[PDB]
Amino acid sequence: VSPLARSVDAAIPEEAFNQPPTLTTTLPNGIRVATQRLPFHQTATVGVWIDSGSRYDTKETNGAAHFLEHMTFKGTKRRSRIQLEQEIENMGAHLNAYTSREQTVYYAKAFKKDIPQCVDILSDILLNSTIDEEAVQMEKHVILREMEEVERQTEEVIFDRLHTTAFRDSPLGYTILGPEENIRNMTREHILEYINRNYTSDRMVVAAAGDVDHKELTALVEKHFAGLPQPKRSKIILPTEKPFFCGSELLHRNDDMGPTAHVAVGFEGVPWKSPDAVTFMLMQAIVGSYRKHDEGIVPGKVSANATVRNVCNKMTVGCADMFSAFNTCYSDTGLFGFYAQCDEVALEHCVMEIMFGITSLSYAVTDEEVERAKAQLKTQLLGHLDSTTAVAEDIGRQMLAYGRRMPLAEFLKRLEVIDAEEVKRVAWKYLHDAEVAVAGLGPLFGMPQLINLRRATFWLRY
Amino acid sequence: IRFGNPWRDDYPEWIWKSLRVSRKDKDMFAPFFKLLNATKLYEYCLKDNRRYCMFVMGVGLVSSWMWSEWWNSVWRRINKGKLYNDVPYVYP
Ligand SMILES: CCCCCCCCCCCCCCCCCC(=O)OC[C@H](COP(=O)([O-])OCC(O)COP(=O)([O-])OC[C@@H](COC(=O)CCCCCCCCCCCCCCCCC)OC(=O)CCCCCCCCCCCCCCCCC)OC(=O)CCCCCCCCCCCCCCCCC
Ligand SMILES: [Zn+2]
Numbered sequence: 001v002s003p004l005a006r007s008v009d010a011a012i013p014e015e016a017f018n019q020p021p022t023l024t025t026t027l028p029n030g031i032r033v034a035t036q037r038l039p040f041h042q043t044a045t046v047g048v049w050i051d052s053g054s055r056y057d058t059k060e061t062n063g064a065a066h067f068l069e070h071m072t073f074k075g076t077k078r079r080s081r082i083q084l085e086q087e088i089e090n091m092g093a094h095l096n097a098y099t100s101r102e103q104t105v106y107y108a109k110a111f112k113k114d115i116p117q118c119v120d121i122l123s124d125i126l127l128n129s130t131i132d133e134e135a136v137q138m139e140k141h142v143i144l145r146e147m148e149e150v151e152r153q154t155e156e157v158i159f160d161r162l163h164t165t166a167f168r169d170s171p172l173g174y175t176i177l178g179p180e181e182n183i184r185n186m187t188r189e190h191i192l193e194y195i196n197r198n199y200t201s202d203r204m205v206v207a208a209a210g211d212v213d214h215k216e217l218t219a220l221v222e223k224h225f226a227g228l229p230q231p232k233r234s235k236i237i238l239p240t241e242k243p244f245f246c247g248s249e250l251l252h253r254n255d256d257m258g259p260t261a262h263v264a265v266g267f268e269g270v271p272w273k274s275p276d277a278v279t280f281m282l283m284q285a286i287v288g289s290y291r292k293h294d295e296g297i298v299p300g301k302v303s304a305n306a307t308v309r310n311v312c313n314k315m316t317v318g319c320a321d322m323f324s325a326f327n328t329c330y331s332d333t334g335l336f337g338f339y340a341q342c343d344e345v346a347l348e349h350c351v352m353e354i355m356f357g358i359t360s361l362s363y364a365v366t367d368e369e370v371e372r373a374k375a376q377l378k379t380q381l382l383g384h385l386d387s388t389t390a391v392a393e394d395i396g397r398q399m400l401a402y403g404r405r406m407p408l409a410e411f412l413k414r415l416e417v418i419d420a421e422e423v424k425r426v427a428w429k430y431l432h433d434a435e436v437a438v439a440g441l442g443p444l445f446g447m448p449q450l451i452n453l454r455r456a457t458f459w460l461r462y
Numbered sequence: 463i464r465f466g467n468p469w470r471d472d473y474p475e476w477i478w479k480s481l482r483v484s485r486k487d488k489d490m491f492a493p494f495f496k497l498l499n500a501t502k503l504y505e506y507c508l509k510d511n512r513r514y515c516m517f518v519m520g521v522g523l524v525s526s527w528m529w530s531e532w533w534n535s536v537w538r539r540i541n542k543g544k545l546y547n548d549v550p551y552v553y554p
Binding site: 458 | 509510511512
């Protein structure tokens, strides 16, 4: 009867249900088009999402997929390098691209009136690019330089080394750039072979968001993407083998690069379509992140996150400069773990504290911790869907992974019914007493043994 | 003579060959590991340390008893006709 028991208990806000639909169509040649109209915008983002990457390179030509990225902006039959650059500038538009292990993306940002001219440019550079042998030799100097700057961003180097040792027996372990000797001996014939084997109509999605009309985007695509080859099958219906996960360590000791070490640990995860994928997203948020030079308004020593609290109070001074948990999904496997930076003499304490927090998911996590993590996850995910680019990336990425876009209300309904007993079930099945892979760099004299890390995945209490 | 000689010692050629043999990707005992894994003993009795210790104390209690009983039978068979219970004493 107390007013303290008549509070407004609205689980999922009504705004989650009153969202504009994402419209989809499949064309005769196999290209898929997907659009969501956001009336409160004057600009728009349109792009092409392709289901190919470094994992679809050959061992002898690892690196052609990234090489092709650069050459796609060097000239066509109807436009030259200079002409392409000037046309974009004269409209005030933007044109970007990136390549990963399983997905490749090209997108543009411009006004509504300039959308057709963007679709024309995207189809041309993707289907009619001239791979001049003379330009292939010039780029070799711009790419060998990028391999030196990438070696200066340490976090990117550590995650590559983590893929190299974990997936030794699969193309999923290849690097995106490729070895040096492959870059030096690259020819235009290696690049054309990658195109003819990977860029087909069944592996491409066109997505848009903003002040966009669906029927008009479906007619422009039907006209400009007609010269796209269809898949050829030689009566071969053989399935792909799931990558094998190797428990191993790969460490670069170096006492001449300062007092800070860098480390990353990984577990075998789950693929996109797994019935347990949502729970892995949540488990990533329970471990969370921390930066010593950017705590915010909550001091780390009194944080609600148990992992942060234990790390900040270690030896009364704190044992980490920063750490963060990650979860990455692929088509047939995944990768779950954490990255960290720390002082030479603090490395052992730091790594073992974060391991202790992951293993707590199987034994002792509380519903207060789960609901704190849920609230943070919702604020970040739902907050990043503001611009037209982030929305378009969400459409395209989901069309390749799931075959559809999940509405916001469905995600929130699936996230709502996950409690502490369901977290314990999933962690007991996948993370408890499991194999781990490790990569590291720097002053590593105090690094734990691989077997120490392997046995920290279970407790002897209980 | 190369064996034991600091002026000549080296491995013979048949030892260098044994070091070059390769059995990569072979496992003749694999059918044994498959059977063990199909009993689910790990999932039900060894993955949790509380249950692991129940398994230790319980199996040890029963095994120790069967071990003693078996050894007593062997002892009686080897020593048939020499033990007290095997030769009843006859009074005059
Ligand atoms: C008349 C004769 C009668 C004699 C009877 C005497 C009793 C005999 C006992 C026989 C026991 C055999 C089994 C041994 C297993 C030990 C426990 C274990 O698994 O350790 C894992 C432990 C942690 O494993 P991990 O891989 O690092 O981490 C895995 C998980 O992530 C970690 O997950 P977590 O974080 O959940 O786990 C943390 C970890 C906690 O880890 C730690 O922080 C360290 C734990 C301490 C080391 C382990 C205990 C054994 C140390 C031996 C001390 C003997 C002193 C001898 C003095 C004799 C004086 C006469 O948790 C524990 O293990 C807590 C302890 C469990 C409760 C107590 C039961 C075990 C005690 C065993 C006997 C010791 C007391 C006997 C005292 C005798 C006094 C007369 O391993 C180590 O710490 C590494 C070194 C371990 C050395 C073990 C040596 C065993 C020798 C036992 C015999 C005792 C001698 C008695 C002499 C009597 C003379 C009169
Ligand atoms: Zn590049």
